[PDB]
Amino acid sequence: YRPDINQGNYLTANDVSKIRVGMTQQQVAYALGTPLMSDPFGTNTWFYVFRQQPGHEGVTQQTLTLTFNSSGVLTNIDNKPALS
Template sequence: MIRPRHILRVFLLTTLLTTCLTGLSACGFVGFPGVYKIDIEQGNLVTQEMIEQLQPGMSRRQVRFIMGSPLVEDTFQPDRWDYPYVIRNGPDIIREAQVRIFFEGDSLVDVTGDYLPSWANPNAEPQGSTESEETEEAKES
């Protein structure tokens, strides 16, 4: 026969345990002040220097040598490689970048995203154009 005293103890221990677990889960939401959170890097680190080495017509093997293996090789888009990159400190995003490389067959044709080579950047002025504009202005005056 179960004594009422044991039932009361089990009930009190269960209530205490659920209260403690609920309190601990709330601490994860609020966070502890002064707790160090490490930076977490995910994806492929891509630099402008790496992107500038890319040239139209390069093979997939040459691109893989410069950029490394892509994080995403989509089976439904085999001519596109994605290089995402993100650094987080807890829930805060410190830096985020995305580069997409497109191929036709085995040849590099286009690069889009946050880092662009000079040949793929539509807003960049062609090299040497400032010198030719300055000489034309000097001739006119």
């Protein structure tokens, strides 16, 4: 009934493998792209969300949260292939 709704960045499941630990902010932006979210509450964290929901066909969400350091250096990775 409703039209397709898209949200967040697009993850190809391949560029995610291209990012290692310690890569810089410029490097992650080049690999994936500028995120549509951040953690404004002090800590610098990049939230990549891949949410799509076609017409009456459920919802699929892939979450990729990147936690950097004070010098913009990647130090942690968390990937959620599907929501709980």
